[PDB]
Amino acid sequence: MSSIGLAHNVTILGSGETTVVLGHGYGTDQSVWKLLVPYLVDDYKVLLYDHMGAGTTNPDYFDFDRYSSLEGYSYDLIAILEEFQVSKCIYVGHSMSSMAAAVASIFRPDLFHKLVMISPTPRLINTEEYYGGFEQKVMDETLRSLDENFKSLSLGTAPLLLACDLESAAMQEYCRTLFNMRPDIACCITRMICGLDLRPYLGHVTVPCHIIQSSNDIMVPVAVGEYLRKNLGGPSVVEVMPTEGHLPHLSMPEVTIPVVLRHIRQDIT
Amino acid sequence: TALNDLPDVILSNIMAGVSDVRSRNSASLVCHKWYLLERATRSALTLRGNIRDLFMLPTCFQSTSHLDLSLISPWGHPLTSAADPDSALIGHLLRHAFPSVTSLAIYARDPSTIHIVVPQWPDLERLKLVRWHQRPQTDAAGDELKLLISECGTLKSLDLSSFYCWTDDVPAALGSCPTFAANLKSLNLLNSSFSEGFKSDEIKAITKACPNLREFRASCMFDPRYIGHAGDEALVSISVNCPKLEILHLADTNALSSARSDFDPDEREGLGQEEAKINAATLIEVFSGLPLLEELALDLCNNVRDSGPALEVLNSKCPKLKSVKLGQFHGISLPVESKLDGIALCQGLESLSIRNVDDLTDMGLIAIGRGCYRLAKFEVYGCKKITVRGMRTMASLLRKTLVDVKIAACKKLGAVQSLKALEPIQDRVERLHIDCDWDCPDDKTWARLRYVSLWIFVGQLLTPLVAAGLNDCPELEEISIKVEGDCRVLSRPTVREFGLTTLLNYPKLSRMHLDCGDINGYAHTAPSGQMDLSLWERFYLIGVGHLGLTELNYWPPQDRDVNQRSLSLPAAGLLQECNRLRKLFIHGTAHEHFMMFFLRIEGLRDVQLRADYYPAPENDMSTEMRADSCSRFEVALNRRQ
């Protein structure tokens, strides 16, 4: 079949005129939707893909220059959607993948009908006037662990630093999956995430966005939802569910799945 | 005279004695005559390769009689896909490449694979079906196994011990053709993946359909809590229907579990601890009906009491008996004064395996040692009363023959006590299993010890092993470590490493099995203040690169709720440091980035991800494994020249 499909492990499931595109967060793969896919195939056409950084993809295909910025991921999403004749899709994305889909909607408003976001964030690094993520001081430790791992792997030794070796107790959970790919790719993707700042660009997002957060989420502050709602250029709705952890759609499905299904099927936004 | 000048017949006789496949490959590269002789005399072949390049199959093995197709990459992938008309060519290709196959082992993922490959050899004698994935939904029962029944040949042995199906498929298939059942001499239904074992009625049907059986193994449902449990009537029917049985192995499905918590009555939440529907009189009748019995195993998870008289009848009515394995058979040996009784009267036993006997004391062990004086392999599991004195005395009694011992879960025998108790046979024991229980309260050269098996709880260190007594083992070539326990409640270990570097004490250690598959934790998301399984993988694999291992089987720990056994970054990084690995098998999943770490190993030849556990990853969207990743990894691995 297509080289794009083989490169991104694209799978097409179900049937129907409406297509649902599921995008995992960084450090996981399309298998993170193993519990949501059964609830969708009976009434939606489901497209599952792995973005190029994922550990299930060929590390040779990973271009550091292309994927040092979010625009590369947005262009890859556009290319995948164009390859499979998908238009007006419903995109459900985890953290920082939904931001890539939002940028893609900025580029191609036609390809997207709505956006469902699970704990998104426009910028991950807190500033003086914006509290929507983590202090650069604590993300520096994660970057240092990734750099030490890459340095160890380059010399032929074992990369032995883990997210559980951090003392933040929230960076442990948030950065858990960043240690699930090749260390150099991990460093590149993590720096892309740290340098990301979509606050200027939120005004161009016109497609409706459905934001799903968690109650008192210790990783992504709940105020990010209100900030996004205010600064989005299209209709938006924020829902807070009683979940926890970095992967609610896999670890707590009996709570997360109904919320995602309701936001998929409700079109008012 | 030169070796090549010998007559070809005796040279072929020499070549048939070359069993190691590595040495056969070496010998095939000596000369044209040697290549021809090796290709003529190679009997067993285990096909290694990818499904994509199957049409590149070598045709030099025209004389192989045992063919094993269960390990073709991707492991467990369907060899034949029914949606493709081209799949019929695979059967012809296999028939042409290996025309003289009489024993076949194939991974029967789909019915089409069986229907296309198995009929290719009418003269097939033994068949082994392997399936760890889910059973496909069919119209009726037995349809998948009814494709086996060919009306142009005679199959003699069928092995379904690794073929997951429904327990009603087997009686349905055997009942559709009486000739096929009558031609069977061996039937291995001993699958631990059955959700429930065979019912009494199913066992009756299976035994009735197959009167000529010589070997019968089955995972039966003996628990009297469920309707249709196997009982006295089932055993009586087995004895009546198959008088010619030589091997009879019956076990409860939970008794076949890798995790001890599934069958151990101590570790079960009140499960078991209730008498099974088996009586001493019933066992007497069953043994009376089986005169040719040679190997007997009845591994139950429900107590049987006062079984001594039955085991006494065993000795008289079964003169050929050599092996006895008992599970939860109480009252096995209660000697009075100096009169032997129970299992101790079976003086012809060669191997005896005992599990969970509440009535056993030191005197029972002594009586077994004095009566079963030909015993060359003893195994005791979960006996709470036997202590070091009884075990040491029994070992001294059997000091001429005992070379295979296993002491597990015994309360009063820790590692130190077991190693002290095995003192009389220390210079003669070859295989040994002990539990790494360091907290149990209360010359030195293992000259012939070649294999050691260890069971240890999660989070326990291996370092006290050398101080326990296993110090000078000049011949130890293989050690198996099994780790079990729920680590979700444990805190971070105070010590950084498990202690695999403690195995540098043994110079000949080259093969290792590290089975951590029964560790339950959190895979990718720990809730809060918890540590995920990558920390434990690092803990249990630090220092593995220092050992000179040539072979390693590793079982990654699992998160039971998500049902995944992924390899993590520290595990792959530490396995990469094993520079002398020739074979590396990981019984779990690993994505492409971590699998590509293993290319740094210079001498690596056999690498595979074998998810031989139930249930297996169903598709590419359920785990991180991908078919393209496997193909690329194998292409790159077989490209290093």
Next chain:
Amino acid sequence: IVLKSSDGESFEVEEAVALESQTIAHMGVPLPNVTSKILAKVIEYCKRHVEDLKAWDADFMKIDQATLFELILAANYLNIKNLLDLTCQTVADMIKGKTPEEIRTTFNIKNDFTPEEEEEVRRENQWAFE
């Protein structure tokens, strides 16, 4: 019964034991092939094989290449299956872990494989799990 070798050396033999060889039992005793030591060892071995169960059988093959070759070549003349087995499964144990070069060295065999032929044989051997 007394036997004689090829070079002219005459050796006595115990009876009954001689029925072990199906060729001998089937048919003084003018057998011309076994030469002294070979016949002595063969008869002595079959003698033990009437009553170290295998530890005498393993020590029994502590002889060198020449004696082992003579032993098997004449045990084929006596058609003795047990002797054939016990003997050949020593020339087989000497083809244990060893490179092709080492086998050629131990048995003085000379290579006749062109490099493409070796490439073909290695590609074929890649299809087997060792």
